[PDB]
Copies of this chain bind each other. A is one copy, B any other.
Amino acid sequence: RFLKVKNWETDVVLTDTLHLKSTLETGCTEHICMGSIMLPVRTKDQLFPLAKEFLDQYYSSIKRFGSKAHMDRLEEVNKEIESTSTYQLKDTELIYGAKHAWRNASRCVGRIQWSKLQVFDARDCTTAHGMFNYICNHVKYATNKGNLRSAITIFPQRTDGKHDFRVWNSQLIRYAGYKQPDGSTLGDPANVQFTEICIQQGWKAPRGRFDVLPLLLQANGNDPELFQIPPELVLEVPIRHPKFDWFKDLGLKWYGLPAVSNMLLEIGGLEFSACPFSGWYMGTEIGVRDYCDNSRYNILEEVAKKMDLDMRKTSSLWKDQALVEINIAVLYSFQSDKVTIVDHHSATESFIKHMENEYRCRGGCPADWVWIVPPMSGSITPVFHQEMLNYRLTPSFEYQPDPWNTHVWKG
């Protein structure tokens, strides 16, 4: 069975067959759509089938399906699963793995870049100090002095679920949040809980509005350890505006490297619970969400006051005007300091080109419209008008529980 999707601006219609290769469940049924819900030890039994499916896909992509090398690899992986209950990916399969997980990530608008992903193999790592070293290199290579390069570092895969590697941070670079006694928050409200776990673990907090958190790193199931990232490795950008001189006086900055460190990477049934990855920013992530979400830095009012808009009635659209101002400032500041960034018009146009290409070369592109459409100016980007089909392929990036809720403490 085939499925068509229509772009309602261009009337271009595309035919999906890729959805047939999908297994994992979406969460919806014929009677209910869960398209807007934010969230979606494995046994030897369930493992060979998963490995086989992955190797069939790997060997197809390199035009060696059914080859002698294909059959021997399958034989060898099966022998390794029965003897040891798990197996080890070759380098090449890992690289292929990590690339396909990004390519398969239906909420990522940046997937046109999926095949340029520098993969660092940290599976020989055994200790939290080793993890810190691997993370510094990643950050140094990814940043590349403002000319960002996508990368991912992959720590040993899960074994019995009791020896897991985890990065306790949600991103490698993120600002502290502190709840004050009077109920206000200083710094970033999204990071208060984690900030508190750093303090308790012995971090001496500076207590400002923009303090880069320390790394909290768990090797082999052991209690996690604190490490400060060398500041010379943390590239940060002061935010100013090209026309409004008072903007600089709001004291805002952001860091340049967005580096998600809390997802789980699944490849051929193997689970990599520590797999930090990095790209570069679309401007709306910082300007709309980080700065203007009511539950984050929430600077809308302060900016509107300084612009002197009519804040007495919402129908003045003062909120909408202040928001476009902040986003202009964000992009202006990055471009001036020569730090890679993409605006939402350019990223969405890329994405539609990527999606057509994928329907042609691959037979489909899973895409999550709720996440792909940008959080400002949605209908003037071409993604608003594109029908999209969302389904789950592997390899994949998955959510996982916060480590502080599951970890057994040693003391």
> Which A positions have Cβ atoms within 8 angstroms of B?
3, 5-6, 8-9, 19, 22, 25-38, 283, 288-289, 292-295, 300, 314-317, 319-321, 323-324, 327-328, 331, 335, 343, 345-346, 368-370, 373-380, 384, 386-391
Residues of B within 8 A of A19 (CB): 31-32
Q: Which of A6, A323, A327, A370 has the most CB of B within 10 A?
A: A370
Q: Is the pair A33, B33 in contact by a Cβ cutoff of 8 Å?
A: yes
In whole angstroms, how far apart are the Cα atoms of A343 and B313 in the complex? 10
Chain B residues with CB under 8 A of A377: 319-320, 323, 376-377
Residues of B within 8 A of A26 (CB): 28-33
Q: Answer whether A30 and B27 are a contact pair too, CB < 8 Å, given A315-B331, A324-B320, A376-B320.
A: yes
Q: Is the CB of A331 within 8 A of B317?
A: yes
Contact A346 B314 (CB under 8 A): yes
Measured between C-beta atoms, what is the minimum distance from A183 to chain B in Å?
A: 16
Please, could you name 24 A-B residue pairs with CB atoms under 8 Å apart, sorted by A?
A3-B32, A22-B31, A26-B30, A26-B31, A26-B32, A27-B30, A27-B33, A28-B29, A28-B33, A29-B29, A33-B33, A33-B35, A33-B390, A36-B386, A36-B389, A37-B387, A315-B345, A317-B331, A319-B380, A320-B380, A323-B377, A323-B380, A373-B378, A377-B377
Task: Point out the residues of chain B lying under 8 angstroms from A36, CB to CB.
Answer: 35, 369-370, 386-390
Copies in the complex: 2
* Among B37, B373, B376, B384, contact of A5 (Cβ-Cβ < 8 Å): B37
How many Å from the CB of A221 to the closest CB on chain B? 31
Bound together, the chains give a CA A389 to CA B320 distance in angstroms of 28
Given contact pairs A32-B389, A283-B315, enumerate 11 new A-B contacts (beta carbons under 8 Å).
A22-B32, A26-B32, A28-B28, A33-B35, A36-B369, A36-B390, A292-B379, A317-B324, A317-B327, A321-B324, A376-B377
**Contact yes or no, A327 B331, CB < 8 A:** no
Cβ contacts under 8 Å, A346 to chain B: 314-315
Asked if residues A34 and B33 are in contact (CB atoms below 8 Å), the reply is yes
Chain B nearest CB, measured from A367 CB (Å): 8
Q: How many Å lie between the Cα of A374 and that of B317 in the bound state?
A: 13
The 5 closest A-B pairs by CB, nearest first: A35-B35, A375-B379, A28-B28, A36-B369, A314-B345
Closest to A106 in B: B33
Q: Which residues of B contact A314 (CB under 8 A)?
A: 343, 345-346
Q: Which of chain B's residues have a CB closer than 8 A to the CB of A35?
A: 28, 33, 35-36, 369-370, 390
Provide the bound-state CA to CA distance between A38 and B26, in Å.
Answer: 19
Please indicate the chain B residues that have their CB under 8 angstroms from the CB of A390 in the complex: 32-33, 35-36
Minimum C-beta distance from A225 to chain B (A): 31
Instruction: Give the CA-CA distance A378 to B376 in the complex, in Å.
Output: 5
CB distance from A28 to the nearest CB of B (A): 4
A359 to chain B, nearest CB (A): 15
